[PDB]
Amino acid sequence: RNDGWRSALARESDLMLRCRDERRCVRLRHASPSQYRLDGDDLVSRVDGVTRRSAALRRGRQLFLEWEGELLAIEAVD
Amino acid sequence: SHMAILHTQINPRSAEFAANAATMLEQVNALRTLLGRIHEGGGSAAQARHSARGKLLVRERINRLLDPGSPFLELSALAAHEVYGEEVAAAGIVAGIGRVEGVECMIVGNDATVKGGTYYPLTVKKHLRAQAIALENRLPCIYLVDSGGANLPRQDEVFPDREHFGRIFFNQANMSARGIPQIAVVMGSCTAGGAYVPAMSDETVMVREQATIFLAGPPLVKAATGEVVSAEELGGADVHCKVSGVADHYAEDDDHALAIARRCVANLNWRKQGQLQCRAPRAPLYPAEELYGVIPADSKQPYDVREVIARLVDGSEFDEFKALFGTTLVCGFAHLHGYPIAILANNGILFAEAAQKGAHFIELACQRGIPLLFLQNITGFMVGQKYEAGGIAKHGAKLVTAVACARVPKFTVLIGGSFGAGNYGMCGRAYDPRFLWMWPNARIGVMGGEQAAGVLAQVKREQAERAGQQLGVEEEAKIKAPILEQYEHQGHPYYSSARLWDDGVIDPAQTREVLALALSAALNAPIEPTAFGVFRM
Amino acid sequence: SHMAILHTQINPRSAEFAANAATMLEQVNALRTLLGRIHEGGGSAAQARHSARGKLLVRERINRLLDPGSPFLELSALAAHEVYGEEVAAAGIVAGIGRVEGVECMIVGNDATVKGGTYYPLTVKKHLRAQAIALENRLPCIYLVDSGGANLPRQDEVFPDREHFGRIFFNQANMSARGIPQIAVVMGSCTAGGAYVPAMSDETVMVREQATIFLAGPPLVKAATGEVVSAEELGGADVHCKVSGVADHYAEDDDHALAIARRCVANLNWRKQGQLQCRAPRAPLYPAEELYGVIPADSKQPYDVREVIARLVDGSEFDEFKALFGTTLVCGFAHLHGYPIAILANNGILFAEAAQKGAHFIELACQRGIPLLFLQNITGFMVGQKYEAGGIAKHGAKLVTAVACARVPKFTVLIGGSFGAGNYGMCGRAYDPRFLWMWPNARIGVMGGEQAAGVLAQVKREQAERAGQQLGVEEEAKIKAPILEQYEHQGHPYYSSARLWDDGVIDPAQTREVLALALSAALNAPIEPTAFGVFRM
Amino acid sequence: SHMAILHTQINPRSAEFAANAATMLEQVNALRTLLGRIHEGGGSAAQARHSARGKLLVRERINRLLDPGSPFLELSALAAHEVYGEEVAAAGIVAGIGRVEGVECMIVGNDATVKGGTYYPLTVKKHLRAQAIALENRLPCIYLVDSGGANLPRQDEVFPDREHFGRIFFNQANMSARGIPQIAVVMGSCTAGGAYVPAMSDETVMVREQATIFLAGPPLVKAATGEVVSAEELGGADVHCKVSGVADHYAEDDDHALAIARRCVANLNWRKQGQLQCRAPRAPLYPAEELYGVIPADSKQPYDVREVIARLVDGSEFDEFKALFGTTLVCGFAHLHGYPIAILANNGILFAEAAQKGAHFIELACQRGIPLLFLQNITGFMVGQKYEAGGIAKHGAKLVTAVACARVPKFTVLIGGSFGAGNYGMCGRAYDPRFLWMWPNARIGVMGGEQAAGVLAQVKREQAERAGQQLGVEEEAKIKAPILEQYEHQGHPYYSSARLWDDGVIDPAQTREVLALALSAALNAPIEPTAFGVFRM
C-alpha cells in the first residue's frame, strides 16, 4: 500500500515529477486521507462538497491528465 | 464463523467514553507535536547551514530512496529525549523499515546537523538496535553514512564495551556472512570510527566532492608527523573510487547516490523465507480510533481488554482458549491483515492459573508456528500467604520459560502498565520480541511509585527499630518524597523511548497498522521450530 | 623442533631490567592489596553480623563447594570499583569458574553483606556476563542465591531494557533448553526478582529456617491487601519443599546445602564437547615472572613482543607466519599447556600489510580449528595521505571481518594499549572473545589523552576561525586541560574492569596459567566451523 | 531504471563497422557450411545404405523424439574434425539437450553410418562430456543406442583409463542413484561395450528384427567354443523382451521405439529444483546482429566490451560494480531472458586491481545465488618488475580461488582470446563451467604464436651462450618457424571444438539465446551454496 503511511505524523510521499518542461519535487502530506481518489481512467475530486471527475490515465513512464481542456503529460525525473 | 465474533459493549456516544477519549487523544497530540520538533534536527540553525553545502537532509535522503509512496516505520524517534545535557534530536540518527525496490529494508543515516552527527552513547545503541531488527528479521541494510566521529567527551560509554561502537562492524560482517546484504552510501565526512561502515559493506557508494572516508581526518593527521593536507585529497570520493578501492560506485550527488543505491538493492535476487497460512485480509468491525475512548483515563481503572482486541483483529473474529479460566489473562487466536496470530493480553492481576493457561497456549502457538502477540497491562502477580505456598512462583516461571524459549516471531505492545514480574512473563524488552512498542498512556516501572517507596522506607524503620527506636513521620516522609516522584518520572513513555527500552511510542489507533507492517517484515526471515527448556511442574 | 625456539635477548640481571620489573611489581602489589580490600565485602561490620545469622559467607560457600584444592578463576573482582556513590565490593556478587565433581562449572553467589545483596546496575551486568561465559563455553551452572531484591533507588538501569535483570531468567531457560544444567541453592532472602532464579532452574536447594522464596516478601505483602505474616510462613524453606514444589532439596544449612549441590553435578552424565589435538604439556623456557622486567616502564617505549610470547608458550617454541612482512603484527602457532593456539600479538603500529597478514593467518587457524590468542599493544593504524589512498582503510577492514567471523575460541589479553580501530581489529571487548583480560600496565581509550584534546580543541578554533575569530592560548588551553585528564583516568584498568569491559585485571606473571585454565574450560563446548562474511579485496 | 542503460557508441552504418561485420559474417558462414558437411554423417554412401535396412537416421531419430518444434542445443558438433586419419563425423555421436515431454533432456545417439558407429577415442570423450552436462544440471538421459563396438585399432585410448569407455557405465549407475532417470532406446547392433548402455538403465527399449544386445556378437561367439548362431537368435529383440529381461519395451520399429521412449519421460514425476528470482523477459535494445560489427577484424585491436554486453542482456540495462577501478575487467549485474546474472567480461590486460575487483564480485554473486557469466577476451596479466613485486601474483590467485570454488552456475564464452593465466582466472575449461562456448573469431593458446617462439628460442641461445657460442640468425629462425605455425593452427576454434575443449562453436549473434537455453536447463539442478578456500591476502 503506497499510501505514504507513517508512524504518528501524516502520510508522506515525496515525488520527483516532471510535466511540460518544469520539474517539481511534490511533497504530499495529507492527514485527511481524502482529496483525490481515482478509479479506472478517472480522477475524482471532493473539492468541498462539490465532487468533480476529471479524466486521467497512465501509459508507461508517462501519465496524462486532462487539466482545463489541455491534456498535459507528467513523467518521472531520472 | 459468525460466533468467533466480538460484539462490543462500548457506547461510542457515551459521556464517560468521550471522557477517556478526550485526554487520550490529548496525549497523542502531545507526541504528535514533539515528534515534529524532533524532525527539526540540529535545528533550523545548522539545518540550513547543511543544505548550504548542497547536501540533501537526512530525512529527505530517506524519502527519496524509498519506493514511491512506500510506508516507513520509524525507530525510537524519541531517542535520547532530554537525556544528555544538550538537545540531540532522535539521537543524531534516523532509521526505520521501508520498501526499496520491493524489499522490506532497514535504513540508517546520520543527521549531520545534530551536534555534527557524532556518535553519542544512545546513538550507538540506536544504530545497533537497528541491526538487531535487521538480523532478527533478515532485512537487507542500507546505511546512509554522514557522520562526524564518536562524541569525544563521552568516549567511555561509546568506545570500549561489547555493546559499544565497533559492535557495529561486528554485527555488519556477521550479517554479511549470514547473507543479509550490506550497502553503504557515504554522503559526508566519515572520519575514524564510521570509516569502517563503508569499508565493511558488500557494496559502497560515494558522492564526489562531498564524501570522504579516511581513518584519520586532517585534524588528527596533522597531529601525526606534521603533514598538512585537504580532506578531499586525504580520503576523497575520487581517491577511493579510482585509486584505493574502498568504494564501488561513484556518485555525482545525494540524489544520484540514492538512485545508485536503489539499483544495488534491485539485483539482490532477494526472496522471503517466512511462511504462514495467511488468508484474505479483512478489516476490523469497529473503527480503530474508537480505542481512544476504550482505555479508561484513570490509570488504576479496570476495563475489558477484549475491547482493544476487537479493534485490531480481522473482522473482530477471535476464538478464545481456556475461555473462563485464569481470566486475568486472555488468550486467543485471530488473524491480522491476513497473517494468523496468537494473542496474549492482560486482564488484571495474574494468579497461578493465568500463567499455566498462558504457558499451555504458547505451546500451541509454538507447535503451529503462529506468531505471538503480547498486550501488556499487568500490575503484577497476586501476593499473599496461600498464594505463595501455592506455587505462584513456580507457575509464573512456567510462563516465563515458554516465552523465553518461543522461537516464532513475538510482538509486544504496552497498552497499560508494565510493572514487575509481569513485564517479564509477558514478553518484555528482555525476551527479544522482534519489535516492542508503547502507547502514550502506558507506564513501565519495577513497581508503582509509593509501592516501592513503601518497602524502601519500611526496612528503614525496621533496621531502626531493632536498634532501639523508630522512624518518626518526620524522617520517614522525607525518605518517601524523592522515590514517589522519581518513579513517576522514570515510568513515562518519553523517558522510556528515549533510552530505547522500546522501539518507540505509537498512536493507539494505529496499533493494528503497525502490527501488520511488522509481521509482514519479519517474514523476510524463517519461523524456526521451538525448543523448550525444562518446565518446573 | 630446536629451531622453533625463541632464544631471549633480555638480561634478567640488567639494571634497566630490574627497573621495569620494579615499577611493574609495584602495580601488581597495588592490585593485590586492592583485591584483599574487596574480599572484605560489606566491611567487617555487616560481614560479621552475617555469620551471626549462622550464614556461611559468600566466598566461603564457594571454597566449600569446589573440589578439594581446585583452582578458581574469578571474574571482574574490581567490579563497580569507585563507581557507585558508596562501596559495593565486587558489585555484590562473586562469580568464577571452578571444578565441582570433576566438571568445570560457572558459579555465582551474591554477598548478602554488600548493600543487602540487592542488585545495583553493575551487579546485573556481572550476573549476566557470567551466563555468557557459561553459554559460550558450555559450563553447567550453580547459582548460590542470597539476595535482597533490586537496588530500588536505581531501578531505571536495573529493570527495563534487554540486557537488564530478567535477562537472567531469559538466559537460564535457554541454557536449560540447550542442555546446560541450571542449579540453584538458596541460602537466604530471595524476594521478588531473584524469586525466579530458583523457580527457574532444573534442580533447587533451600536451607531450612533461612531460605525464603516469595514473590512479595512481607513488607510488600502487608502493603498489599493488609495481612501480616512472617517470612518463613509466607515462603520459607518448608513451604516450598513439602507444599508448593518450588524447590527440590531440603537442606539443613549452608554446609549441607552445598553438599546437596555437589551431588547434583554428580549425576549430570556430563561429557566435554570441544576437541583439539593437544599434546603433552611442557613448561616455558624462561621463568614466567621474568615478564615483569620485559615490559618497559615508559608506556611509549618500543619493545619486542616475542619476548612475552617466549614466556607463555610451551618450550618457548613458536612457529612464525609471514615472518618478515608487516612486522608490525607478529603471528604464529604454538602450544599452551598442551592445547594448540594461534597467536596474534601487536608490535607497534599497524599498516595495511599487517592486517592482510593477520586476516590471512586467521583463515589458516579458522580452517584447522585452532584457538585464537590476541595480545593487544596497539596505538592505532598508520595515518597519512598515501597510507590512506592505499587502502589502509579497506585492508584494516578485512582483518575485522576475519576476527568478527572466527568461530573458534577467541582469547584476548591487554598487555599494552587498546586505542582506536586497533582495539577492534585485535578482538576487543566487542568481538566476543570467550574471555578478555587486562594487565595492570595496560591502558584503553578511544584515543590518547592529548590526541583527543588535540582535535576536540582543534575544531573549536576552525569553527571560530571561519567565524572571523581565533581561539587565544587562554580559551584553547581551558578546553584541553579537562579532557587531558578525563582520558588519563578513564584509561586505567580499575576504571575498565570496574565496568566489566574486561573479565578482570590479572598478574602479568600468571598469564600463561590463566589462559591454560580458560582454554580447557572453553572445551566443554564444541569448536564450531567458521563462515566468513564478504572480504573487500 | 532508465539509468542502468547502455547507450551504444557504435554506428551500424559506418564503413569500419561494415568492415568488421563483414569478415565476421564470413567466419560464420564458414562454420555454417562445415556444420552442414558434418550433417551428412558417413556420407550419402552408407548413410543411404542405412535407411536401406529400414532404419531412421540419427538426427532424424532426434527430431522425431523431440517435442513438436522444440529447440535443440547441440554439443561439440565439430567433434573429431580433421583429428583422426579418416573423416569421423561429429565423432559418430550426436548429443544435445531438448524438450521431451516438457523436460529439458540430455539426448545421445550414435551415427551407425559413421565408421560403423564404433567408439573412437573422442566418441567416448563426447559421450562422457554429455553425461557431465547431465549430472551437473540434473537432465534425465536418453541413450539412442546404435553402435558397433569400440574402434579396435585405437583401443589403447578407448578402453583402460579412468575417463575412458566404461566410465560411461560408471556415470550411469551413479546418475540412476542420484535419481536422474536413465532411459535406453536400442535401434541397432550393440555388441560387447555398448551392450551395457541398455543393460544399465532404468528403462530400456528394443526395435524388433533390428535391435541386438549381446556380450559377444556372432563373430566373437564363433571365435569362442565354435558355435555358429545368427544375430537375431543370440541376442535379438524377442530374446531380451520375452526371455532374459534385459529390455523392457518391445517396439515395432524406429518410430515406435521413440514413441515408447517419450512415454517414459512422461511418467517421470519430474520437477525442477533450480530457483531464481527471474523477472519477466524483455529483449535487448540493439539487434543482437549488430554484434558482427562491434567485434573488430583486427584480432589485437581495442574495442569496448560493454557493447557486446548491451546486445545480450535484457533491455540493455546493466548495473556496473567498481565502475571505475581496474577497468581492465568489467563486472556487473543484469538479467537475461528473465534469469538474473552476474557478468565478468575482459576489457584488456589484467592488473592486480582487476582480479581483486573480480574476486570481490564473485563473492557478492555467490552470496545471492546468481549465475556467473564469463566473457573471455584476455591476452594475459600485465608483467613487469614492480608489477610482480606488487603481488599481481597472489591477487591473481585470489581470483581463481573465487572462480574455482564458486558453486552457483558458471557459464563461459570465448569472444576474444584465451591466453595463459587469463583462461584460468576467467573460468576456462578446467573450472567446470556448466557450459563453455567459442565464437568463430576467438583463438585459444598457452600464449601467442611468436610469444612462445620468443622464449623457446631465447633459452636455446642462453644455454648456447654460456657454452661459448651464440645462436646464428640461421638456426634461431629455424627454431621459431615451426612454432610460429603450430600455435596458429592449434589456436583455432575448429581445432578446439574438435577435441571438446568447448561444447561447440556458436553464432556470435545467437549468443543471447544460447545462454537463455542453457541457464534455464541448469535450473533443473539446485543452486548450491558456495564454500571458499583460503584467500591469500
Ligand SMILES: CC(C)(COP(=O)(O)OP(=O)(O)OC[C@H]1O[C@@H](n2cnc3c(N)ncnc32)[C@H](O)[C@@H]1OP(=O)(O)O)[C@@H](O)C(=O)NCCC(=O)NCCS
Ligand atoms: C566532524 C567534523 C568534520 C565537523 O564538520 P562540520 O560539518 O564543519 O561541523 P562542525 O565542525 O561545525 O561541528 C560542530 C559541532 O560538532 C561537534 N563535534 C564534532 N566532532 C566532535 C567530536 N568528535 N566530539 C565532540 N564533538 C564534536 C563540535 O563540538 C561542534 O559543537 P557546537 O556546534 O555545539 O559548537 C569535524 O568536527 C571533525 O573533523 N571531527 C572529527 C571527529 C573525530 O575525529 N572523531 C573520531 C572519534 S571515533
Ligand SMILES: CC(C)(COP(=O)(O)OP(=O)(O)OC[C@H]1O[C@@H](n2cnc3c(N)ncnc32)[C@H](O)[C@@H]1OP(=O)(O)O)[C@@H](O)C(=O)NCCC(=O)NCCS
Ligand atoms: C532484603 C532485606 C530482607 C534485607 O535484609 P537484611 O539482611 O536485614 O538487610 P537490611 O534490611 O539491613 O538492609 C540493609 C541495606 O539493604 C538495602 N536494601 C535492601 N533492599 C533494598 C532495595 N530493594 N532497594 C534498595 N536498597 C535496599 C537498604 O538500603 C539498606 O541500606 P543501609 O545499610 O545503607 O541503610 C529487606 O531489605 C527486604 O525485605 N527487602 C525486599 C526487597 C524487595 O522487595 N525488592 C523488590 C524489587 S525486585
Ligand SMILES: CC(C)(COP(=O)(O)OP(=O)(O)OC[C@H]1O[C@@H](n2cnc3c(N)ncnc32)[C@H](O)[C@@H]1OP(=O)(O)O)[C@@H](O)C(=O)NCCC(=O)NCCS
Ligand atoms: C559392428 C558390426 C556388426 C558392423 O555391422 P555392419 O552394419 O555390417 O557394418 P560393417 O561390417 O559394414 O562395418 C563397416 C565399418 O565398421 C568398422 N568397424 C566395425 N567394428 C569395428 C571395430 N570394433 N573396430 C574398428 N572398426 C570397426 C569397420 O572398420 C568398417 O570400416 P569401413 O566402412 O571404413 O570399411 C561388426 O563390425 C561387428 O560385429 N563388430 C563387433 C565389434 C566388437 O566385437 N567390438 C568389441 C570391442 S568393445
